[PDB]
Symmetry: C3
Subunit: 229 residues, 3 copies
Amino acid sequence: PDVRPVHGVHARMAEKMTLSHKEIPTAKASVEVICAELLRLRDRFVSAAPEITPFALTLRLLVIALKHNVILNSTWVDSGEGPQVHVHRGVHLGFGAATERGLLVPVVTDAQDKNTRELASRVAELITGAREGTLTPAELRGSTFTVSNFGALGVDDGVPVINHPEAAILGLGAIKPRPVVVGGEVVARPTMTLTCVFDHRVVDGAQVAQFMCELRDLIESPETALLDL
Amino acid sequence: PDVRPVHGVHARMAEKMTLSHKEIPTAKASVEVICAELLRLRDRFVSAAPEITPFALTLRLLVIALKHNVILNSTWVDSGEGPQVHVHRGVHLGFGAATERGLLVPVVTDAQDKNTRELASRVAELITGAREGTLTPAELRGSTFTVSNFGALGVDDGVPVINHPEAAILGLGAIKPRPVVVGGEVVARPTMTLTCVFDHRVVDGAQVAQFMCELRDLIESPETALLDL
Amino acid sequence: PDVRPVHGVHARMAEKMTLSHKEIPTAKASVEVICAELLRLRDRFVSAAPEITPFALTLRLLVIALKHNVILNSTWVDSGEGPQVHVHRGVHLGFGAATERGLLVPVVTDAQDKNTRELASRVAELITGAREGTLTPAELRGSTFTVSNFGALGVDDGVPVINHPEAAILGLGAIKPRPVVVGGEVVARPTMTLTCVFDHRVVDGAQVAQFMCELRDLIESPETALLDL
């Protein structure tokens, strides 16, 4: 066989993947989301601000949903005085950026303090930075929740691996036209499947469902929630 | 961070989740099921007996399918004289009931001996009991198979965790109108995705497929199988 | 309980399932594939060569995709000089064949060297051999990649277990008519969901997406790629 020694970003990925597999009892919950209004909103602003993308808007709405479902942004801890869940006050949002040198996971520090435009600009800088290889050590660490946008790569739905010691990860399926029922009629709509993989020690099914339903409802009516645009 | 010590129902969940993750090599099989006839049957009886719900009817049809696919209701055993599968004669059916105090898993003991009406009434008592916190220790133990109804919480499809030492768990996705093809035409129907997660030491793919196909076919033509109504 | 001692093909399955669960940090990626052209191509040749099946054509197109995405056909190795990925030059394609005596996994040795007709004939011999119990030890070993055709058993989508020490497995969902959008219209098409489960130490998300998108595109326009017919 062609023998490839593993180093760098591959070695660390391989390390991080093994740690998660070993420690975290996972479960998964998925919801189908209609993205017509999301893309309409994008169309409204993309000329004046090209960084307002469906991905950026989704991350903004995710931050809102995490502020309302705090248990999703947390860590299981056993060190010391018995079993504890540490619920994090800051949302430091990791997201995958696939590059020539492999995938990197830039982090939006204190995403909870950012308005839609602020978040969109920062995500754009981080996407650019990952691609050009100019990210600092601080921009590649400290996440409390992570997103995997395999949809941008053409995957319809997927099951990503929790970024240890986080309690959950969100996978974003591909946005494309699919058939859905609206007012009893079969119609075409842009849609996507969201899949949350979670540490079932930390988060229960009722909690994940509440989070995902909220996220779906924000994305399906984003204009009011993003009234800071 | 906000530090939450873990006790009670959370602590036991966290314990049960860890045990399953560690021991069970899982695989998953899903089938899409059309629920038009299921809801029609419900409509026929819900006035005189409000406990005949789609969930209750689904559990009844699940019991029938387990009686016909006995390997699904079993336990992997290594204690003693080598590897054994213990196939259980009784179907003691656990199901999730999410409550203020977390999720509980009431159990229908000897579900195999119950007719549709008997099962529906018992499920209703158990749902009430979980909500009001009046379940006995005996009503929270002894399951041989478990159902997770994340569909009632709005989740379209999901991957639940096997309730150790059981061999499989069934997830019930949300029932809602979705597009399907019937006689070559695209039509709206109420549908749901069923997902079975199974111990692949115990159950093989042919066995899970046979079980799930039977369950689908019962749900899609339930009137004859539930001729004890 | 009815106590069943475990031997033979069941015992080895149980062994292989446990090994995979313990070692491999998995992730999963799925794509929906339209199969209209695949079945049209089959119709063209099934009279003169009954072994040209949708399954055989899918495996042929899979081999092509693996030749172009070599990392999918590989093994994680830690023995010796640190972490290595061994990329295999031969594609020795395992596939599930469910039989009276359980499931067997016949192997097409050097599948990369076979033309469409050669592969189709060999797959047919191997299906026959598994059913009649006439396979040699050599025809049941040495795979570098494995396929699980749970679709033939009626399963719409599934999550199979990697055949250790392989880096990935492909699940083939059931081919049937489902609604899809084509040129903005909701239409009926035969479709299937492909699910790849992969060792995330070996393969990254960009690599799996590239593989799966290629496989989808081959299946959706197979006539040119199978111009050796």
